[PDB]
DNA sequence: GCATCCGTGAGTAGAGGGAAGCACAATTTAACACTTTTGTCAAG
DNA sequence: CTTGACAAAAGTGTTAAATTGTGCTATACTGGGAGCCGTCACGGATGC
């Protein structure tokens, strides 16, 4: 018992009897009148219409709480003519709660047709419940249409949007998700007519104007889902995908040792230069603080122009070239 | 992890703990003077959803009348358990019986048993046995063409109700503006409607009948009961480890071996918390830590496809359900929808 | 006692394996026209 | 060491094109589906 969350939810919603046609009309009328009374109260009292509905909703639900009591007492201090709109607002809020509770069976019937598309059954039901709440606010009973006629549009829309937003590890925009679904549906129809898997050219032509084979292949590459690192490989359960993927981010011991050898040999060659010549190259190349320094900031640090540093920076470079050619001690590092 | 650490401190069995944690039964934190089945409700008492609803919202029932037949009772007339409200249905509780939807309104004009057929898209705006001034509306309608008004003064009588609602409540007619509104909770002696002239004599929830010019107080209690880890967390916060240790030490003096063995196991957990300095309420989570991303990588491979760990999917489920509960709470969703979301959030953490 | 629940069971290697559309509003991206930089060729 | 004086490069501002996010649709429709025993055998702890 209680091991099935789906069974537990179905039992709870079955304890609310279904509404008759007479009962549905009364609830819809009460909600609409209550919303109008809230608008009337705000105009007279000057407060935010959004804030007033929260105070009424808080009292009905029961159980900033400090200001909720303060605002409520001001409403109750109105005269009898204005206190009547308070009564209508309270009744309208209670009717909205009862109207939503009696239509929970409708969402379950709709939500069972969307399973197997990336979301669990309970997740589909909860997303559908959000659409049901929206339909209550926008429903109009003057048109003499039944509630299920208008609420079905909102319940289906909420489930569809949730799938396009939460069913993929790498989220794709809704406009591109629709394109992917159309592309797959078109390919299936061509496959059963051609008797074989269609090519990219055939899919592109049937897709419509503005589509070529290059765009078809690019869309298919986008629609690829990542693979799990814990996917078992082989019958014995000891090997997984992650056991074959090397790490390319951290430097290897061989690469780390080459950097150290190059640095110690480079600084050894710099000692053959003058004290001022070495400092210019070490700053104009960025061997201190990691940042290259232009002829201006170098000039600012040493108090000289930029044309002067240009010559001495080049002069020190040419002396290094002559030394290297006579020993061949710095060539293997390139 | 058998034996449960939370259950040992709170003296709750494994069956009881699962029922509260996964939203199956309520647990009492404040009885507020509630009586169930003639026995006062105690703290730490487990209530079913049916029992909780009776204590919190009262008892009432509706009986659908067959088409054409007419009830033998009047509006606002008290009935007893087993009394035949209609020839086709019998009542199951005592209370005030009120008409729900009169399918035919028989207005008695004074100049006259005129018969009016009321469509489901129409509502009656006057009460039974009431004086209606000439020109006032009697039955409202969506279309003004089919709207019915009062030709002259008379007494309006309701006939052929769609159903009869029997609610165990007390009716207090009011003369002036009511000092309370629908949804409030009152206690005996409180000023109810007419600034102290009319006062309630029983606990209950008050709803205002504007058309009937009466105030109804449905007998109920403002009991404090909660489900989930929220109710367990408060119980752990109120625990006094020093006081509990002394009580268990005295029970250790029982000559029976079974009681001594039971008291020793509980005292071992109590002593462990006292020595270490941890708090019992820390066993319930408020903030969930997140592993560093490099330990749950999403990396590209020699080709172009991506590979990722299963922990990323488990983190995505928890975030999606946590964000949906925030939106549901802001919209004032009913408790049934909220309770399902909370149960799903607990399972996502597991 | 006797019912219910829960964690445990050798090592290394290989080798295959691996299901709507639309309109409209915000929001980001790319192209392009000036404009200050900053290295430079030539003197002095 | 310095001044001049370009010439390409880097930097900035505006703006149209592309992409992304959000709301809505009115006959009536109101409690899921899948599974199926060589169900692994044996101690240890716990509840009653």
UniProtKB/Swiss-Prot annotation, chain B:
Belongs to the RNA polymerase beta' chain family. Transmembrane segments: none annotated. The RNAP catalytic core consists of 2 alpha, 1 beta, 1 beta' and 1 omega subunit. When a sigma factor is associated with the core the holoenzyme is formed, which can initiate transcription. DNA-dependent RNA polymerase catalyzes the transcription of DNA into RNA using the four ribonucleoside triphosphates as substrates. It comes from Thermus thermophilus (strain ATCC 27634 / DSM 579 / HB8). This is DNA-directed RNA polymerase subunit beta'.
């Amino acid at each position: 018992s209680t091991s099935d969350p789906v069974r537990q939810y179905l039992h709870e919603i079955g304890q609310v009897p279904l509404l008759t046609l007479e009962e549905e009309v009364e609830l819809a009328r009460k909600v609409e009148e209550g919303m109008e009374a809230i608008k009337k109260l705000s105009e007279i009292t000057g407060l935010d219409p959004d804030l007033i509905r929260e105070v009424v909703r808080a009292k009905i639900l029961g159980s900033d709480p400090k200001t909720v009591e303060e605002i409520d007492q001001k409403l109750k201090s109105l005269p009898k003519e204005h206190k009547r709109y308070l009564h209508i607002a309270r009744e309208g809020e209670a009717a909205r709660q009862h109207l939503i509770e009696a239509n929970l069976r409708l969402v379950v019937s709709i939500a069972k047709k969307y399973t197997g598309r990336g979301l669990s059954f309970l997740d589909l039901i909860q997303e559908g419940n959000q659409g049901l709440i929206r339909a209550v606010e926008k429903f109009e009973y003057k048109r003499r249409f039944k509630f299920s006629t208008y609420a079905t549009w909102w319940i289906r829309q909420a489930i569809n949007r949730a799938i396009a937003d939460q069913a993929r590890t790498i989220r794709i925009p809704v406009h591109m998700v629709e394109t992917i679904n159309k592309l797959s549906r078109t390919a299936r129809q061509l496959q059963q007519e051609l008797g074989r898997e269609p090519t990219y050219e055939e899919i592109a032509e049937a897709m419509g104007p503005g589509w070529d084979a290059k765009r078809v292949e690019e869309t298919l590459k986008i629609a690829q889902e990542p693979v799990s690192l814990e996917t078992p490989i082989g019958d014995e359960k000891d090997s997984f995908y992650g056991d074959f993927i090397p790490d390319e981010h951290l430097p290897s011991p061989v690469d780390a040792a080459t950097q150290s050898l190059l640095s110690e040999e480079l600084e050894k060659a710099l000692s053959k230069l003058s004290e001022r010549e070495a400092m210019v190259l070490k700053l104009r190349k960025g061997l201190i603080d990691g940042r290259e320094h232009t002829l201006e900031e170098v000039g600012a640090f040493f108090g000289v122009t930029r044309e002067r540093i240009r010559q001495i920076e080049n002069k020190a470079l040419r002396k290094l070239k002559y030394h290297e050619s006579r020993t061949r001690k710095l060539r293997d590092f390139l | 992890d058998v034996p449960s650490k939370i259950g040992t401190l709170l003296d709750l069995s494994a069956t009881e703990l699962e029922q509260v944690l996964y939203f199956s039964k309520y647990i009492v934190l404040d009885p507020k003077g509630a009586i169930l089945n003639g026995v006062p409700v105690e703290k730490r008492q487990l209530l079913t959803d049916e029992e909780y609803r009776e204590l919190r919202y009262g008892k009432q029932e509706t009986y659908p009348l067959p088409p054409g037949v007419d009830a033998l009772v009047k509006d606002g007339e008290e009935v007893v358990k087993g009394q035949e409200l209609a020839p086709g249905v019998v009542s199951r509780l005592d209370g005030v019986a009120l008409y729900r939807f009169p399918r035919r309104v028989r207005v008695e004009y004074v100049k006259e048993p005129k018969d009016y057929r009321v469509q489901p898209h129409m509502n009656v705006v006057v009460p039974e046995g009431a004086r209606v001034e000439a020109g006032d509306k009697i039955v409202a309608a969506i279309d003004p063409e089919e709207e019915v008004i009062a030709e002259a003064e008379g007494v309006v009588h309701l006939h052929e109700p769609a159903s009869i609602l029997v609610v165990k409540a007390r009716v207090y007619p009011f003369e002036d503006d009511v000092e309370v509104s629908t949804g409030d909770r009152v206690a005996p002696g409180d000023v109810l409607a007419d600034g102290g002239k009319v006062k309630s004599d029983v606990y209950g929830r008050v709803e205002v009948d504007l058309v009937r010019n009466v105030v109804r107080v449905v007998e109920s209690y403002d009991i404090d009961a909660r489900m989930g880890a929220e109710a367990i967390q408060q119980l752990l916060k109120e625990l006094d480890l020093e006081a509990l240790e002394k009580e268990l030490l005295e029970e250790m003096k029982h000559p029976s071996r079974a009681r001594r063995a039971k008291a020793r196991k509980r005292l071992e957990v109590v002593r462990a918390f006292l020595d270490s300095g941890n708090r019992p309420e820390w066993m319930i989570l408020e903030a969930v830590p997140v592993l560093p991303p490099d330990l749950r990588p999403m990396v590209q491979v020699d080709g172009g496809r991506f590979a990722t760990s299963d922990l990323n999917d488990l983190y995505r489920r928890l975030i999606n359900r946590n964000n949906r509960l925030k939106k549901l709470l802001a919209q004032g969703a009913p408790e049934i929808i909220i309770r399902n979301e909370k149960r799903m959030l607990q399972e996502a953490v597991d």
